[PDB]
Amino acid sequence: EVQLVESGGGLVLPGGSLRLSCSASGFTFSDFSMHWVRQSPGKGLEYVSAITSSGSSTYYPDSVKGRFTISRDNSKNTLYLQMGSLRVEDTAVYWCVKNSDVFRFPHLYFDVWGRGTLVTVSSASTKGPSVFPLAPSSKSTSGGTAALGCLVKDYFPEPVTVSWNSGALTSGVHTFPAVLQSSGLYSLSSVVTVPSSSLGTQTYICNVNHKPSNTKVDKRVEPKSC
Amino acid sequence: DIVMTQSPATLSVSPGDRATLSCRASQSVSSNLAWYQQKPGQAPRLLIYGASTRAAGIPARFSGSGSGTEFTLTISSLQSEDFAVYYCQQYDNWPSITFGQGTRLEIKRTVAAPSVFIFPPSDEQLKSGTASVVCLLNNFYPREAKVQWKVDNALQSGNSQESVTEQDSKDSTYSLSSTLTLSKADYEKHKVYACEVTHQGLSSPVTKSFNRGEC
């Protein structure tokens, strides 16, 4: 199928520089124009750069002109966004986005989107999380089901990704919005409800990844004897 | 620039019913308009292009209409999976484009009481000098729920944080997580840790508790 796989991003200092990448598969990349679209509070969704199928022309809104540069390498099927002179206002999720074929003119719309990269412009330092088990016990069971989870505490900046059993476990998971602690660090919990009956035969591992600090933690969550 | 204005900002519709979402362009964009559906933390997904042409693989209950400045997205036979924020986008000046500010579609359902669970702090964390106690409220509706932390039956204030999930795409419920965090030294000064939960779906509050010495 068609895919846009985004890499790059994370934390960057005010006035700093950062390059995002997006590799394309499943279609003829050199046939389609691409946009970078960003999303942040207040401003919502807004494009920040556009480039033709061949890279022959680029288009920028006034807000980013002279600071952001879009480019593509159709040999490696990769789209780039070079971000310079970064501003506090530039914190946003940055989406790689594919346009429909220009032969559809005037209907040039966004039919394929990457998964987004969160860029955080801040002078603060990165901090990876501590991951603690939320162990199942008699205090987290009801009606034949048992709740368990992981507490992902004290990281900066967002985001952390949490999966369960390397993605084999998705049903019944709730990974909560992070909270901002008075320290300026984030904390989040991720929980899952499973059968009480199989706690002794099944293995539950939360996989935590904090890409801004390159911290990856797998925590096995064992039942507690209470 | 062309300004896209959506209305309403939010609406709440029962499953099986028909939702009407509006988008107004500040000047005519002919039919050069697209609709997108974005669930939280996911990429927007194209629903309609050309104001009224449904994108491949999109369910028939999504329908776009309009031309010029007034555009409508109609979602019939609404499903819990249709929870999302819906954006319109004009591409009349492509590659220059603008998006509307979004309409958040919330699914109504019947009242559902929370399932309440409590988690004592881990030994890993205690060795670090901190105790976090977590109270979990699973799969309730409506969103409004109150959590009170009681330590040795004393109501707590100022040492907890909570957040609620986005609406669940399968059953339209909410879940809530609340963390009470104390220093290890303060944790060891008390015995009973409890969370008391109030919700429309519960006739009386539900209390989950443990004793620090038992877990």
Binding site: T52, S53, S56, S57, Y59, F103 | -
Partner: peptide, 12 residues
């Protein structure tokens, strides 16, 4: 390519 030419018209 044919597409590049039309996209240039739109970008300019």
């Amino acid at each position: 390519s044919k597409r590049s030419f039309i996209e240039d018209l739109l970008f300019n």
